[PDB]
């Protein structure tokens, strides 16, 4: 039942997007507010290499099966950095409680969304080649650096990239809901 | 005899995720500018570009039409102020259209009293989205809030309407006149200004 799945997926995506935005703001205001972190964020996202629609017309040009598989690859690619974010931060003797709490919910909620999306793909495209290819994140040594400024910069970039990709996946899923269920008459 | 003071790009806003505008102000404590040039480049490109539209956003503005606007991509922009004596550059501004979305107010707000048979009577409020927002494809998602108050009341009553474009209010004071307004925000981003008020007389027999 597509409509219940899509409604649940969109609840989860919108919720994740909002939590990632609030996490990044809290980290920014607490640790990076006064400094040139934004300049070092430029071009730093592990999912950049993916070919993703950047405006409405590109989105409209993308067929639904490739679109769904795009969302799935993005989500699959975030499992690794979210796991290490939570591990690294939880293992600090004095972790920021508001930051840790959000990271842990985004980690658990992202899994649930990916489970919904896999259900959506099985209903809508029951015989796709089950093809796993997604971009690899490998930024763990930089979160691990002893240099405090390089460290906070690596965290800044991960949280900036997370805020971006969560918003993007939420927007793509809202578009696809309208397209698939409502023929673009939301 | 003085070159311009240092200008500042103080705001950017997108009304619908498809276009955006930014605004700058001249610095004080320099000479009068005779020209401004806003230039920028984008994340992941080396090309430098000039502001494509200095007219549409009015005075001291840069407007980015659809062919120049995308989501999920940082714009790095600066404006220079020049006269015959010299020039001055703003600080670089890092802007993502994803985070500056603020829609225009909702349109066509209309209010009515409805008193049907042995069902509670109610105030029926209705409105339309701002124009040029693409809700039908799910590209954009809009959320609405209503406020209403009689004259001289110290507080507004606020009602979240979610994504509906109509709403019913039950607990009104019989005989009172209410000012009613509506505003909207994207799913992620800033609330619009409140719409112009519409007024409604609640009848005596409520
Ligand atoms: Cl706001
Ligand atoms: Na605009
Ligand atoms: Na201008
Ligand atoms: Na565009």
Curated annotation (Swiss-Prot), chain A:
Modification Phosphoserine occurs at: 13, 21, 77, 122, 153
Disulfide links within the chain: 45-161, 178-186
Positions of glycan attachment: 18
GO (cellular component) term, any one: endosome lumen
GO biological process assignments: cell surface receptor signaling pathway; female pregnancy; lactation; mammary gland development; negative regulation of angiogenesis; negative regulation of endothelial cell proliferation; positive regulation of canonical NF-kappaB signal transduction; positive regulation of lactation
General function of this protein: Prolactin acts primarily on the mammary gland by promoting lactation.
Family affiliation: Belongs to the somatotropin/prolactin family.
The protein's name in its UniProt record: Prolactin
Residue numbers of the full-length protein present here: 43 to 227 of 227
UniProtKB/Swiss-Prot annotation, chain B:
Keywords assigned by UniProt, alphabetized: Disease variant, Disulfide bond, Glycoprotein, Membrane, Metal-binding, Receptor, Repeat, Secreted, Signal, Transmembrane, Transmembrane helix, Zinc
Main location: membrane
Single GO term (MF): protein kinase binding
One Gene Ontology cellular component annotation held by this UniProt entry: external side of plasma membrane
Keyword Protein transport: no
Domain Fibronectin type-III as annotated: residue spans: 3-104, 105-205
A GO BP entry: negative regulation of apoptotic process
Binding positions (Zn(2+)): 187-188
Chain positions carrying an annotated carbohydrate: 35, 80
Location within or outside the cell: Membrane
Residue intervals on the Extracellular side: 2-206
Tissue: Expressed in breast, placenta, kidney, liver and pancreas.
Bridged cysteine pairs (disulfide): 12-22, 51-62
Keyword Protein biosynthesis in annotation: no
Motif (WSXWS motif): 191-195
Comment, domains: The WSXWS motif appears to be necessary for proper protein folding and thereby efficient intracellular transport and cell-surface receptor binding. The box 1 motif is required for JAK interaction and/or activation.
Function: This is a receptor for the anterior pituitary hormone prolactin (PRL). Acts as a prosurvival factor for spermatozoa by inhibiting sperm capacitation through suppression of SRC kinase activation and stimulation of AKT. Isoform 4 is unable to transduce prolactin signaling. Isoform 6 is unable to transduce prolactin signaling.
Subunit structure: Homodimer upon hormone binding. Interacts with SMARCA1. Interacts with GH1. Interacts with CSH. Interacts with NEK3 and VAV2 and this interaction is prolactin-dependent.
Disease affiliated with this protein: Multiple fibroadenomas of the breast: A benign breast disease marked by lobuloalveolar growth with abnormally high proliferation of the epithelium, and characterized by the presence of more than 3 fibroadenomas in one breast. Fibroadenomas are adenomas containing fibrous tissue. Hyperprolactinemia: A disorder characterized by increased levels of prolactin in the blood not associated with gestation or the puerperium. HPRL may result in infertility, hypogonadism, and galactorrhea.
UniProt similarity note: Belongs to the type I cytokine receptor family. Type 1 subfamily.
Protein name: Prolactin receptor
Species of origin: Homo sapiens (Human)
